[PDB]
Write a protein that holds these residues in place. Structure first.
Motif, PDB file in Angstrom:
ATOM      1  N   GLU A  35      23.393  49.364  11.839  1.00  0.00           N
ATOM      2  CA  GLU A  35      25.308  49.460  12.658  1.00  0.00           C
ATOM      3  C   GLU A  35      26.251  49.830  11.793  1.00  0.00           C
ATOM      4  OE1 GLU A  35      24.350  45.130  13.630  1.00  0.00           O
ATOM      5  OE2 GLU A  35      25.963  44.682  11.861  1.00  0.00           O
ATOM      6  N   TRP A  36      27.379  50.051  13.336  1.00  0.00           N
ATOM      7  CA  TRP A  36      28.375  50.177  12.178  1.00  0.00           C
ATOM      8  C   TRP A  36      29.426  48.786  12.516  1.00  0.00           C
ATOM      9  CZ3 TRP A  36      31.061  53.514   9.735  1.00  0.00           C
ATOM     10  CH2 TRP A  36      29.808  55.486   9.276  1.00  0.00           C
ATOM     11  N   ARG A  37      30.350  48.297  11.521  1.00  0.00           N
ATOM     12  CA  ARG A  37      31.241  47.274  11.408  1.00  0.00           C
ATOM     13  C   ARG A  37      32.196  47.361  11.167  1.00  0.00           C
ATOM     14  NH1 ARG A  37      26.618  44.914   7.829  1.00  0.00           N
ATOM     15  NH2 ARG A  37      28.648  44.422   6.123  1.00  0.00           N
ATOM     16  N   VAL A  38      33.282  46.270  11.657  1.00  0.00           N
ATOM     17  CA  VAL A  38      34.701  46.660  11.466  1.00  0.00           C
ATOM     18  C   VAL A  38      34.582  45.117  11.297  1.00  0.00           C
ATOM     19  CG1 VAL A  38      37.180  46.745  11.796  1.00  0.00           C
ATOM     20  CG2 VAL A  38      35.337  48.438  12.896  1.00  0.00           C
ATOM     21  N   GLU A  39      35.807  44.671   9.622  1.00  0.00           N
ATOM     22  CA  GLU A  39      35.889  43.793   9.396  1.00  0.00           C
ATOM     23  C   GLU A  39      37.198  43.643   9.178  1.00  0.00           C
ATOM     24  OE1 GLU A  39      31.931  42.896   6.808  1.00  0.00           O
ATOM     25  OE2 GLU A  39      34.323  43.099   5.655  1.00  0.00           O
ATOM     26  N   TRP A  40      37.799  42.389   9.275  1.00  0.00           N
ATOM     27  CA  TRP A  40      39.413  42.161   9.047  1.00  0.00           C
ATOM     28  C   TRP A  40      40.430  41.252   9.060  1.00  0.00           C
ATOM     29  CZ3 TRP A  40      37.298  42.445  13.845  1.00  0.00           C
ATOM     30  CH2 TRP A  40      37.188  41.945  14.262  1.00  0.00           C
ATOM     31  N   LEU A  41      41.250  40.549   8.953  1.00  0.00           N
ATOM     32  CA  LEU A  41      41.491  38.671   8.406  1.00  0.00           C
ATOM     33  C   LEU A  41      42.695  38.688   9.780  1.00  0.00           C
ATOM     34  CD1 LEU A  41      41.840  38.171   5.048  1.00  0.00           C
ATOM     35  CD2 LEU A  41      40.226  38.642   6.592  1.00  0.00           C
ATOM     36  N   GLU A  42      42.613  38.378  10.590  1.00  0.00           N
ATOM     37  CA  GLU A  42      43.193  38.283  11.961  1.00  0.00           C
ATOM     38  C   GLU A  42      44.013  36.188  10.965  1.00  0.00           C
ATOM     39  OE1 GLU A  42      44.247  39.023  16.584  1.00  0.00           O
ATOM     40  OE2 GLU A  42      42.648  37.905  15.345  1.00  0.00           O
ATOM     41  N   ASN A  43      45.647  36.120  11.431  1.00  0.00           N
ATOM     42  CA  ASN A  43      46.004  34.636  10.400  1.00  0.00           C
ATOM     43  C   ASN A  43      44.879  34.146   9.786  1.00  0.00           C
ATOM     44  OD1 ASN A  43      47.678  34.388  12.942  1.00  0.00           O
ATOM     45  ND2 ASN A  43      46.232  34.614  14.089  1.00  0.00           N
ATOM     46  N   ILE A  68      45.140  49.204  13.045  1.00  0.00           N
ATOM     47  CA  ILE A  68      45.891  49.323  12.036  1.00  0.00           C
ATOM     48  C   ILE A  68      47.500  49.143  12.984  1.00  0.00           C
ATOM     49  CG2 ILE A  68      47.051  50.737  10.268  1.00  0.00           C
ATOM     50  CD1 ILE A  68      43.743  51.440   9.753  1.00  0.00           C
ATOM     51  N   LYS A  69      47.214  50.321  14.277  1.00  0.00           N
ATOM     52  CA  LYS A  69      47.991  50.748  14.961  1.00  0.00           C
ATOM     53  C   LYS A  69      49.062  49.249  15.698  1.00  0.00           C
ATOM     54  CE  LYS A  69      47.610  55.655  16.748  1.00  0.00           C
ATOM     55  NZ  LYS A  69      47.265  56.185  17.760  1.00  0.00           N
ATOM     56  N   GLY A  70      48.392  47.920  15.802  1.00  0.00           N
ATOM     57  CA  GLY A  70      49.158  47.166  16.131  1.00  0.00           C
ATOM     58  C   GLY A  70      48.847  46.696  17.853  1.00  0.00           C
ATOM     59  N   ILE A  71      48.036  46.596  18.109  1.00  0.00           N
ATOM     60  CA  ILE A  71      47.278  46.761  19.881  1.00  0.00           C
ATOM     61  C   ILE A  71      45.333  46.191  19.915  1.00  0.00           C
ATOM     62  N   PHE A  72      45.462  45.063  19.251  1.00  0.00           N
ATOM     63  CA  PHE A  72      44.466  44.512  19.764  1.00  0.00           C
ATOM     64  C   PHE A  72      44.812  43.245  18.833  1.00  0.00           C
ATOM     65  CE2 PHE A  72      41.989  48.282  19.879  1.00  0.00           C
ATOM     66  CZ  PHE A  72      40.733  47.952  21.502  1.00  0.00           C
ATOM     67  N   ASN A  73      43.552  42.319  19.549  1.00  0.00           N
ATOM     68  CA  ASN A  73      43.341  40.956  19.819  1.00  0.00           C
ATOM     69  C   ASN A  73      42.192  39.883  19.200  1.00  0.00           C
ATOM     70  OD1 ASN A  73      45.833  41.225  21.361  1.00  0.00           O
ATOM     71  ND2 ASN A  73      46.255  38.540  21.155  1.00  0.00           N
ATOM     72  N   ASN A 107      40.909  46.765   2.936  1.00  0.00           N
ATOM     73  CA  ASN A 107      42.023  45.637   2.508  1.00  0.00           C
ATOM     74  C   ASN A 107      43.341  46.055   2.743  1.00  0.00           C
ATOM     75  OD1 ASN A 107      40.672  43.861   2.161  1.00  0.00           O
ATOM     76  ND2 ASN A 107      40.615  44.359  -0.801  1.00  0.00           N
ATOM     77  N   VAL A 108      43.095  47.268   4.125  1.00  0.00           N
ATOM     78  CA  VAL A 108      43.973  48.249   4.742  1.00  0.00           C
ATOM     79  C   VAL A 108      44.615  47.581   4.692  1.00  0.00           C
ATOM     80  CG1 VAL A 108      44.698  50.685   6.580  1.00  0.00           C
ATOM     81  CG2 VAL A 108      42.150  49.384   5.433  1.00  0.00           C
ATOM     82  N   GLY A 109      46.050  47.464   3.618  1.00  0.00           N
ATOM     83  CA  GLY A 109      47.652  46.633   3.973  1.00  0.00           C
ATOM     84  C   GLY A 109      47.097  45.190   5.487  1.00  0.00           C
ATOM     85  N   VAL A 110      47.876  45.521   5.639  1.00  0.00           N
ATOM     86  CA  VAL A 110      47.349  43.831   5.960  1.00  0.00           C
ATOM     87  C   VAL A 110      46.203  44.204   6.989  1.00  0.00           C
ATOM     88  CG1 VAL A 110      49.276  42.133   7.728  1.00  0.00           C
ATOM     89  CG2 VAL A 110      50.451  44.087   6.914  1.00  0.00           C
ATOM     90  N   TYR A 111      46.210  42.681   8.024  1.00  0.00           N
ATOM     91  CA  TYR A 111      44.659  42.169   7.906  1.00  0.00           C
ATOM     92  C   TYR A 111      43.756  42.651   7.265  1.00  0.00           C
ATOM     93  CZ  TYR A 111      47.821  42.533  12.747  1.00  0.00           C
ATOM     94  OH  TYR A 111      48.896  42.670  13.392  1.00  0.00           O
ATOM     95  N   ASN A 112      44.085  43.775   5.798  1.00  0.00           N
ATOM     96  CA  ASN A 112      42.342  43.800   5.853  1.00  0.00           C
ATOM     97  C   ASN A 112      41.944  44.889   5.815  1.00  0.00           C
ATOM     98  OD1 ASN A 112      44.554  43.078   3.751  1.00  0.00           O
ATOM     99  ND2 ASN A 112      43.326  41.020   2.848  1.00  0.00           N
ATOM    100  N   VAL A 113      41.762  45.702   7.251  1.00  0.00           N
ATOM    101  CA  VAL A 113      40.730  46.307   7.547  1.00  0.00           C
ATOM    102  C   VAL A 113      39.989  46.783   7.094  1.00  0.00           C
ATOM    103  CG1 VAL A 113      40.740  47.739  10.138  1.00  0.00           C
ATOM    104  CG2 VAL A 113      42.332  46.162   9.222  1.00  0.00           C
ATOM    105  N   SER A 114      38.587  47.026   7.546  1.00  0.00           N
ATOM    106  CA  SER A 114      37.701  47.092   6.503  1.00  0.00           C
ATOM    107  C   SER A 114      36.511  48.211   7.624  1.00  0.00           C
ATOM    108  CB  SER A 114      37.138  46.344   5.668  1.00  0.00           C
ATOM    109  OG  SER A 114      37.889  46.191   4.887  1.00  0.00           O
TER     110      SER A 114
END
Length: 132
Positions: free
Chosen positions: A89-97, A127-132, A73-80
DNA sequence: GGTGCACCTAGGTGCACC
DNA sequence: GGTGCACCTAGGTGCACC
Protein backbone atom coordinates in the motif's frame (compact mmCIF):
# COMPACT_ATOMS: atom_id res chain seq x y z
CA UNK A 1 30.82 9.95 -9.31
CA UNK A 2 28.95 9.67 -12.61
CA UNK A 3 27.47 6.32 -13.75
CA UNK A 4 29.97 3.95 -15.38
CA UNK A 5 29.90 0.69 -17.36
CA UNK A 6 32.06 -2.15 -16.02
CA UNK A 7 32.98 -5.55 -17.48
CA UNK A 8 32.93 -8.81 -15.50
CA UNK A 9 34.27 -11.44 -17.90
CA UNK A 10 34.00 -14.16 -15.24
CA UNK A 11 30.28 -13.57 -14.70
CA UNK A 12 29.95 -12.77 -18.43
CA UNK A 13 27.94 -9.64 -17.70
CA UNK A 14 28.18 -5.89 -17.71
CA UNK A 15 27.77 -3.97 -14.45
CA UNK A 16 26.44 -0.40 -14.45
CA UNK A 17 27.92 1.12 -11.29
CA UNK A 18 26.91 4.56 -9.99
CA UNK A 19 26.90 6.52 -6.74
CA UNK A 20 23.95 8.10 -4.93
CA UNK A 21 24.94 10.24 -1.95
CA UNK A 22 28.02 8.21 -0.99
CA UNK A 23 26.52 4.72 -1.54
CA UNK A 24 27.50 2.66 -4.57
CA UNK A 25 24.92 0.57 -6.40
CA UNK A 26 25.40 -1.82 -9.32
CA UNK A 27 23.05 -3.42 -11.85
CA UNK A 28 24.25 -6.44 -13.81
CA UNK A 29 23.35 -7.10 -17.46
CA UNK A 30 24.31 -10.58 -18.67
CA UNK A 31 25.61 -10.55 -22.24
CA UNK A 32 25.55 -14.34 -21.94
CA UNK A 33 21.78 -13.90 -22.26
CA UNK A 34 21.19 -10.51 -23.89
CA UNK A 35 24.32 -10.59 -26.05
CA UNK A 36 26.96 -7.92 -26.49
CA UNK A 37 24.95 -5.52 -28.66
CA UNK A 38 21.67 -5.68 -26.71
CA UNK A 39 23.39 -5.54 -23.31
CA UNK A 40 25.36 -2.44 -24.28
CA UNK A 41 22.15 -0.85 -25.56
CA UNK A 42 20.09 -1.63 -22.45
CA UNK A 43 22.95 -0.34 -20.30
CA UNK A 44 22.78 2.84 -22.38
CA UNK A 45 19.04 2.99 -21.70
CA UNK A 46 19.68 2.74 -17.95
CA UNK A 47 22.37 5.42 -18.32
CA UNK A 48 19.77 7.63 -20.03
CA UNK A 49 17.26 7.03 -17.22
CA UNK A 50 19.88 7.91 -14.60
CA UNK A 51 20.64 11.08 -16.57
CA UNK A 52 16.95 11.99 -16.28
CA UNK A 53 17.23 11.95 -12.48
CA UNK A 54 15.49 8.63 -11.76
CA UNK A 55 16.63 7.10 -8.48
CA UNK A 56 17.44 3.50 -7.52
CA UNK A 57 14.18 2.68 -5.75
CA UNK A 58 11.71 3.72 -8.46
CA UNK A 59 13.70 1.53 -10.87
CA UNK A 60 14.09 -1.47 -8.53
CA UNK A 61 11.51 -1.11 -5.74
CA UNK A 62 11.66 -4.88 -5.27
CA UNK A 63 15.26 -4.33 -4.13
CA UNK A 64 15.92 -2.52 -0.87
CA UNK A 65 14.00 -1.91 2.35
CA UNK A 66 10.36 -2.99 2.66
CA UNK A 67 9.19 0.49 3.71
CA UNK A 68 10.58 3.44 1.75
CA UNK A 69 10.01 7.11 2.61
CA UNK A 70 9.92 9.23 -0.54
CA UNK A 71 9.94 12.44 1.50
CA UNK A 72 9.25 13.30 5.12
CA UNK A 73 8.70 16.15 7.59
CA UNK A 74 7.84 18.60 4.80
CA UNK A 75 7.87 21.92 6.66
CA UNK A 76 4.51 22.37 8.35
CA UNK A 77 2.16 19.36 8.68
CA UNK A 78 5.35 17.24 8.39
CA UNK A 79 3.84 15.51 5.36
CA UNK A 80 5.41 12.19 4.38
CA UNK A 81 4.84 9.74 1.52
CA UNK A 82 5.64 6.07 2.11
CA UNK A 83 5.74 2.96 -0.09
CA UNK A 84 5.01 -0.21 1.91
CA UNK A 85 5.70 -3.60 0.34
CA UNK A 86 4.67 -5.61 3.41
CA UNK A 87 1.05 -4.41 3.30
CA UNK A 88 1.34 -3.52 -0.42
CA UNK A 89 0.00 0.00 0.00
CA UNK A 90 0.89 3.66 -0.45
CA UNK A 91 0.57 5.77 2.70
CA UNK A 92 0.70 9.47 3.57
CA UNK A 93 1.54 10.69 7.07
CA UNK A 94 1.08 14.18 8.50
CA UNK A 95 0.42 16.15 11.69
CA UNK A 96 -2.84 18.11 11.96
CA UNK A 97 -2.87 20.12 15.21
CA UNK A 98 -0.12 17.95 16.66
CA UNK A 99 -2.13 14.79 15.90
CA UNK A 100 -0.58 11.96 13.84
CA UNK A 101 -2.73 11.09 10.83
CA UNK A 102 -2.35 8.75 7.88
CA UNK A 103 -4.11 7.59 4.71
CA UNK A 104 -3.53 4.51 2.57
CA UNK A 105 -4.21 3.18 -0.94
CA UNK A 106 -3.89 -0.49 -1.85
CA UNK A 107 -1.96 -1.62 -4.96
CA UNK A 108 -3.83 -4.95 -5.09
CA UNK A 109 -6.86 -2.87 -6.05
CA UNK A 110 -5.62 -0.33 -8.61
CA UNK A 111 -1.92 -1.07 -9.09
CA UNK A 112 1.39 0.58 -8.21
CA UNK A 113 0.96 3.43 -10.69
CA UNK A 114 -2.55 4.59 -9.78
CA UNK A 115 -1.89 4.16 -6.05
CA UNK A 116 1.20 6.38 -6.31
CA UNK A 117 -0.71 8.92 -8.42
CA UNK A 118 -3.55 9.22 -5.90
CA UNK A 119 -1.23 9.34 -2.89
CA UNK A 120 1.01 11.96 -4.54
CA UNK A 121 -1.95 14.09 -5.65
CA UNK A 122 -3.35 13.87 -2.11
CA UNK A 123 -0.04 14.71 -0.43
CA UNK A 124 1.03 17.64 -2.61
CA UNK A 125 -2.49 19.08 -2.55
CA UNK A 126 -2.19 18.89 1.24
CA UNK A 127 0.98 20.99 1.04
CA UNK A 128 -0.95 23.54 -1.04
CA UNK A 129 -3.38 23.89 1.87
CA UNK A 130 -6.84 22.71 0.83
CA UNK A 131 -7.57 19.47 2.73
CA UNK A 132 -9.09 18.54 6.09
C1' DG B 1 37.29 -20.95 -25.61
C1' DG B 2 33.97 -17.34 -26.68
C1' DT B 3 28.78 -16.07 -27.94
C1' DG B 4 24.19 -15.53 -27.83
C1' DC B 5 19.55 -18.15 -28.78
C1' DA B 6 16.36 -20.93 -26.39
C1' DC B 7 14.38 -22.48 -22.60
C1' DC B 8 13.33 -22.66 -17.53
C1' DT B 9 12.11 -20.88 -12.98
C1' DA B 10 10.53 -17.85 -8.91
C1' DG B 11 8.35 -14.04 -7.41
C1' DG B 12 5.91 -9.61 -8.19
C1' DT B 13 1.73 -7.90 -9.89
C1' DG B 14 -3.02 -6.69 -10.91
C1' DC B 15 -7.08 -8.58 -13.33
C1' DA B 16 -11.21 -11.39 -13.00
C1' DC B 17 -14.53 -13.46 -10.23
C1' DC B 18 -17.69 -13.29 -7.13
C1' DG C 1 -15.00 -4.41 -2.46
C1' DG C 2 -11.03 -8.06 -1.20
C1' DT C 3 -8.85 -11.46 -2.15
C1' DG C 4 -7.12 -15.59 -4.66
C1' DC C 5 -4.29 -16.99 -8.07
C1' DA C 6 -3.46 -16.54 -13.54
C1' DC C 7 -0.27 -14.07 -15.85
C1' DC C 8 4.26 -11.47 -16.94
C1' DT C 9 9.10 -10.09 -16.79
C1' DA C 10 13.67 -10.38 -15.05
C1' DG C 11 17.45 -13.34 -13.88
C1' DG C 12 20.04 -17.72 -14.61
C1' DT C 13 22.14 -21.31 -17.64
C1' DG C 14 22.84 -25.33 -21.07
C1' DC C 15 23.86 -25.98 -25.59
C1' DA C 16 24.67 -26.28 -30.41
C1' DC C 17 27.54 -22.88 -33.31
C1' DC C 18 31.63 -19.15 -34.37
Amino acid sequence: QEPVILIDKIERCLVVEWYENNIRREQRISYKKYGNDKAKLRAKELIEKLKSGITFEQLYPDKGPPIVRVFENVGVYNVSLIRDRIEREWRVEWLENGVPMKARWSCKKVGNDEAQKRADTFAQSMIKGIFN
